[PDB]
Write an enzyme that holds these catalytic residues in place. Structure first.
Site, PDB file in Angstrom:
ATOM      1  N   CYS B 143      17.043  -9.631   1.815  1.00 55.67           N
ATOM      2  CA  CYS B 143      17.496  -8.252   1.657  1.00 55.67           C
ATOM      3  C   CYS B 143      18.562  -7.977   2.709  1.00 55.67           C
ATOM      4  CB  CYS B 143      16.335  -7.267   1.784  1.00 55.67           C
ATOM      5  SG  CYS B 143      16.861  -5.560   2.041  1.00 55.67           S
ATOM      6  N   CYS B 146      17.859  -4.540   4.496  1.00 54.58           N
ATOM      7  CA  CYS B 146      16.719  -4.522   5.402  1.00 54.58           C
ATOM      8  C   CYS B 146      17.027  -5.248   6.707  1.00 54.58           C
ATOM      9  CB  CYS B 146      15.504  -5.152   4.718  1.00 54.58           C
ATOM     10  SG  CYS B 146      15.281  -4.696   2.979  1.00 54.58           S
ATOM     11  N   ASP B 147      17.490  -6.494   6.616  1.00 54.03           N
ATOM     12  CA  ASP B 147      17.623  -7.366   7.776  1.00 54.03           C
ATOM     13  C   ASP B 147      19.067  -7.636   8.176  1.00 54.03           C
ATOM     14  OD1 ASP B 147      14.791  -7.625   7.736  1.00 54.03           O
ATOM     15  OD2 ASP B 147      14.948  -9.272   6.292  1.00 54.03           O
TER      16      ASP B 147
HETATM   17  C1  LIG Z   1      12.609 -10.705   3.397  1.00 58.78           C
HETATM   18  C2  LIG Z   1      12.320  -9.336   2.766  1.00 58.78           C
HETATM   19  C3  LIG Z   1      12.452  -8.357   3.759  1.00 58.78           C
HETATM   20  C4  LIG Z   1      12.236  -6.984   3.439  1.00 58.78           C
HETATM   21  N1  LIG Z   1      12.377  -5.977   4.493  1.00 58.78           N
HETATM   22  C5  LIG Z   1      12.164  -4.592   4.193  1.00 58.78           C
HETATM   23  C6  LIG Z   1      12.318  -3.578   5.282  1.00 58.78           C
HETATM   24  O1  LIG Z   1      12.619  -3.936   6.416  1.00 58.78           O
HETATM   25  N2  LIG Z   1      12.107  -2.186   4.991  1.00 58.78           N
HETATM   26  C7  LIG Z   1      11.741  -1.770   3.613  1.00 58.78           C
HETATM   27  O2  LIG Z   1      11.566  -0.586   3.368  1.00 58.78           O
HETATM   28  N3  LIG Z   1      11.598  -2.780   2.555  1.00 58.78           N
HETATM   29  C8  LIG Z   1      11.809  -4.183   2.844  1.00 58.78           C
HETATM   30  N4  LIG Z   1      11.666  -5.158   1.815  1.00 58.78           N
HETATM   31  C9  LIG Z   1      11.300  -4.723   0.440  1.00 58.78           C
HETATM   32  C10 LIG Z   1       9.819  -5.028   0.139  1.00 58.78           C
HETATM   33  O3  LIG Z   1       9.744  -5.967  -0.869  1.00 58.78           O
HETATM   34  C11 LIG Z   1       9.050  -3.773  -0.277  1.00 58.78           C
HETATM   35  O4  LIG Z   1       7.709  -3.898   0.147  1.00 58.78           O
HETATM   36  C12 LIG Z   1       9.064  -3.606  -1.778  1.00 58.78           C
HETATM   37  O5  LIG Z   1      10.284  -3.002  -2.165  1.00 58.78           O
HETATM   38  C13 LIG Z   1       7.907  -2.729  -2.217  1.00 58.78           C
HETATM   39  O6  LIG Z   1       6.795  -3.529  -2.679  1.00 58.78           O
HETATM   40  P1  LIG Z   1       5.828  -2.989  -3.807  1.00 58.78           P
HETATM   41  O7  LIG Z   1       5.016  -1.812  -3.295  1.00 58.78           O
HETATM   42  O8  LIG Z   1       6.615  -2.542  -5.019  1.00 58.78           O
HETATM   43  O9  LIG Z   1       4.830  -4.176  -4.229  1.00 58.78           O
HETATM   44  P2  LIG Z   1       4.750  -5.580  -3.468  1.00 58.78           P
HETATM   45  O10 LIG Z   1       4.353  -5.355  -2.042  1.00 58.78           O
HETATM   46  O11 LIG Z   1       6.095  -6.240  -3.503  1.00 58.78           O
HETATM   47  O12 LIG Z   1       3.675  -6.543  -4.199  1.00 58.78           O
HETATM   48  C14 LIG Z   1       2.328  -6.042  -4.422  1.00 58.78           C
HETATM   49  C15 LIG Z   1       1.284  -7.157  -4.169  1.00 58.78           C
HETATM   50  O13 LIG Z   1       0.351  -7.115  -5.069  1.00 58.78           O
HETATM   51  C16 LIG Z   1      -0.236  -8.622  -5.188  1.00 58.78           C
HETATM   52  N5  LIG Z   1      -0.501  -8.954  -6.556  1.00 58.78           N
HETATM   53  C17 LIG Z   1       0.423  -9.336  -7.456  1.00 58.78           C
HETATM   54  N6  LIG Z   1      -0.208  -9.564  -8.636  1.00 58.78           N
HETATM   55  C18 LIG Z   1      -1.527  -9.321  -8.460  1.00 58.78           C
HETATM   56  C19 LIG Z   1      -2.616  -9.399  -9.341  1.00 58.78           C
HETATM   57  N7  LIG Z   1      -2.815  -9.745 -10.721  1.00 58.78           N
HETATM   58  N8  LIG Z   1      -3.859  -9.099  -8.907  1.00 58.78           N
HETATM   59  C20 LIG Z   1      -4.053  -8.716  -7.601  1.00 58.78           C
HETATM   60  N9  LIG Z   1      -2.991  -8.638  -6.739  1.00 58.78           N
HETATM   61  C21 LIG Z   1      -1.717  -8.945  -7.180  1.00 58.78           C
HETATM   62  C22 LIG Z   1       0.655  -9.427  -4.692  1.00 58.78           C
HETATM   63  O14 LIG Z   1       0.109 -10.084  -3.455  1.00 58.78           O
HETATM   64  C23 LIG Z   1       1.882  -8.559  -4.341  1.00 58.78           C
HETATM   65  O15 LIG Z   1       2.438  -8.969  -3.210  1.00 58.78           O
HETATM   66  C24 LIG Z   1      11.892  -6.602   2.134  1.00 58.78           C
HETATM   67  C25 LIG Z   1      11.762  -7.602   1.135  1.00 58.78           C
HETATM   68  C26 LIG Z   1      11.975  -8.962   1.456  1.00 58.78           C
HETATM   69  C27 LIG Z   1      11.820  -9.985   0.333  1.00 58.78           C
END
Ligand SMILES: Cc1cc2nc3c(=O)[nH]c(=O)nc-3n(C[C@H](O)[C@H](O)[C@H](O)COP(=O)(O)OP(=O)(O)OC[C@H]3O[C@@H](n4cnc5c(N)ncnc54)[C@H](O)[C@@H]3O)c2cc1C
Ligand SMILES: Cc1cc2nc3c(=O)[nH]c(=O)nc-3n(C[C@H](O)[C@H](O)[C@H](O)COP(=O)(O)OP(=O)(O)OC[C@H]3O[C@@H](n4cnc5c(N)ncnc54)[C@H](O)[C@@H]3O)c2cc1C
Ligand SMILES: NC(=O)c1ccc[n+]([C@@H]2O[C@H](COP(=O)([O-])OP(=O)(O)OC[C@H]3O[C@@H](n4cnc5c(N)ncnc54)[C@H](OP(=O)(O)O)[C@@H]3O)[C@@H](O)[C@H]2O)c1
Ligand SMILES: NC(=O)c1ccc[n+]([C@@H]2O[C@H](COP(=O)([O-])OP(=O)(O)OC[C@H]3O[C@@H](n4cnc5c(N)ncnc54)[C@H](OP(=O)(O)O)[C@@H]3O)[C@@H](O)[C@H]2O)c1
Lengths: 319, 324
Positions: B143, B146-147
């Site tokens: 990202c 983010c970084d």
């Molecule tokens: C390197 C990197 C750095 C980032 N840095 C930042 C930052 O500094 N600040 C910021 O605001 N955002 C950052 N992000 C964005 C980050 O991905 C956010 O957390 C995302 O946008 C929101 O995640 P989410 O709530 O949609 O679900 P997620 O957190 O992405 O995923 C939900 C979790 O549910 C679990 N899951 C999946 N399927 C199942 C299933 N069948 N049964 C049970 N459990 C399951 C999994 O473990 C999954 O990880 C970064 C992303 C990356 C890749």
């Protein structure tokens, strides 16, 4: 300042998250917080993710303020009086420095409107003493607070917001009573059907709250409410630990008033899921556009949207 | 068993939705998974330090943020089970869910509910390069917003992998900090838009190297060693080369964890769940989607946490209007 890329008007979660993302992108944003958010009045916020033990609304906005100034946001404690969204650069004027022939205090190529939308209060006697110490205006935010659990709760209003928040407060309070000033509930016919059918709520027509009584100590809670029948005139004191205002809200859309398209209730119309207003170049995040959720975590999210979509506007604008 | 609402996920969207439903005296169950697909806890557990989250002016580690968000969910009474959902049957009146390795063709569901929240995230694709595990979040990221501002990348040579619009958009964003940004397109021509490629090839501090693939990540050999060199390989001749590189940002597409639905709810061209704008309303009445599963334009934790609250209120409103 004299001129900047983006200027933000507001001091709430939307106005600061936009400042955080915009300042970290090296865009040098200026934030007009005013000469004084509605979250500063809240005593403890417990439904914000990342703070499992709750956080005071005052320090949360102070954390978000220092987080904005950390990445280089020019936060000036001045109130915007008039806005000129007609020429190429948007012009802004400070209060007491307004006027038809005064020089603008700051101009920018894009402006973010995050001026919030406060809930209307009645300014009852004793309200200042028990505001956020027994009195509130958001059932989702403060309804679960332990001081209202298994206690008599009172709601003020006859509209749809009253019936919706009254049935929500029934999850915690021992009894919920709604004090509509006139007769014949103003709410919808279908939602009122489930209201009068809910067991733990009772609607008291022709009733107005006159004064809020409670403890007089450091951080004194609400203990009694003085209600007044509006036809007979007999006032009485009843037990009440919680009073929730459920009249509508007032979006701070005064500065635009025709420049940007508004809705029937006064909020700024924006593309759903987006901060794009009707005028290209000005975006709106937070409670100014949101009337269905009215949460800090949601306003903070929309503030990040206004930041990213402003940077895309600024990037595609310069040569 | 049986509950009112079941939430699938462990990220900011899945927990903020769980927080509001649990504070609303509901019975939400949160399935973090058995390290399903990003391990149980969200994609933020891999990030070392989050500095763009409001309320933490000194920054907060992604591990500690999601752990605080976890205990905040269980505080108000969410039944959090660390098991992965395998199959979901959203055809009958009550939604049925099955645990992984316990699915079976004729087995009994582990939990059923009248409403389900989909917050299963959308992880960014990695290349599994040699040394990637050693320098991930120590020089490698996915990202740029983010970084990109991290001090270890400022005034340093940065490299971007990808040829799409996300690559050109993140490359020019990284130009704000790095000394030089180089994008490594695998094929011979940018897959991105004609206008987005125009601003890319015109930006001074970026240079597009067509027919180039990153092969290995090199750096220091200490406990918290940063990335120092990147080995790139021309894809036509085959000659590999080692260049100075302090930052490697993956800019290939993302993978929504929408495998469990696969047709029950409508998806888009890239795989994300389509929802009514500004809402968590999916195409099937009764199931909501919050977080990166529906968001392709922002992909932020503060936006997913916000959208998780959106899925929370509209799920609690949905149940109220169903029994009354
Ligand atoms: C390197 C990197 C750095 C980032 N840095 C930042 C930052 O500094 N600040 C910021 O605001 N955002 C950052 N992000 C964005 C980050 O991905 C956010 O957390 C995302 O946008 C929101 O995640 P989410 O709530 O949609 O679900 P997620 O957190 O992405 O995923 C939900 C979790 O549910 C679990 N899951 C999946 N399927 C199942 C299933 N069948 N049964 C049970 N459990 C399951 C999994 O473990 C999954 O990880 C970064 C992303 C990356 C890749
Ligand atoms: C009693 C009450 C309790 C609440 N409790 C919670 C809770 O527990 N948890 C939660 O998540 N949310 C809670 N909220 C919601 C709270 O209002 C959120 O902060 C809100 O959703 C965020 O709105 P906002 O981001 O648009 O900015 P706001 O918080 O509304 O900030 C408004 C700012 O706009 C500034 N401003 C307005 N006009 C001008 C102008 N011309 N020039 C310069 N500055 C201007 C003002 O100075 C003001 O500071 C509560 C609200 C109220 C009223
Ligand atoms: O519907 P809406 O709430 O979304 O928008 P709205 O038009 O502002 O409705 C306000 C609701 O709260 C009542 N109200 C307004 N001011 C009040 C006051 N000082 N004291 C007691 N009740 C008051 C109103 O009763 P009335 O209908 O009698 O004004 C109405 O029911
Ligand atoms: O949003 P969006 O624009 O990112 O949508 P997108 O179409 O998913 O972007 C894919 C881009 O990243 C490239 N890509 C995929 N895997 C790669 C790999 N291992 N190494 C180098 N490049 C790779 C693709 O090369 P191709 O152009 O060859 O598909 C393509 O240019």
């Amino acid at each position: 300042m004299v001129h900047t890329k983006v200027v933000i008007i507001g001091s709430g979660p939307a106005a600061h998250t936009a400042a955080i993302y915009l300042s970290r992108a090296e865009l040098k944003p200026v934030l007009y917080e005013g000469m004084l958010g509605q979250l500063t009045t809240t005593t403890d916020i417990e439904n914000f993710p990342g703070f499992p033990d709750g956080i005071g609304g005052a320090e949360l906005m102070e954390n978000m303020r220092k987080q904005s100034i950390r990445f280089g946001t020019e936060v000036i404690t001045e109130t915007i009086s008039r806005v000129d969204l007609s020429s190429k650069p948007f012009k802004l004027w400070t209060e007491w420095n307004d006027g038809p022939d005064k020089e603008p205090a700051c101009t920018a190529d894009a402006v973010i409107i995050a001026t919030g939308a406060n809930a209307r209060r009645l300014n009852l006697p004793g309200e200042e003493t028990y505001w956020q110490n027994g009195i509130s205006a958001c059932a989702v935010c403060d309804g679960a607070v332990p001081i209202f659990r298994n206690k008599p709760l009172y709601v003020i209003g006859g509209g749809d917001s009253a019936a919706e928040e009254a049935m929500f407060l029934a999850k915690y309070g021992s009894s919920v009573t709604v004090l509509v000033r006139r007769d014949k509930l103003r709410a919808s016919k279908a939602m009122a059907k489930r209201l009068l059918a809910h067991p733990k709520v009772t609607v008291r027509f022709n009733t107005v709250a006159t004064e809020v009584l409670g403890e007089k100590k450091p951080n004194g809670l609400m203990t009694h409410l003085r209600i007044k029948n509006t036809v007979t005139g007999e006032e009485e004191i009843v037990d009440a630990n919680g009073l929730f205002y459920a009249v509508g809200h007032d979006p701070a859309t005064a500065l635009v008033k025709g420049q940007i398209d508004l809705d029937e209730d006064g909020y700024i119309i924006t593309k759903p899921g987006t901060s794009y207003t009707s005028r290209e170049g000005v975006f709106a995040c937070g409670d100014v556009q949101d009337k269905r959720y009215r949460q800090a975590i949601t306003s903070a999210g929309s503030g990040c949207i206004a930041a990213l979509e402003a940077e895309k506007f600024i990037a595609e604008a310069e040569s």
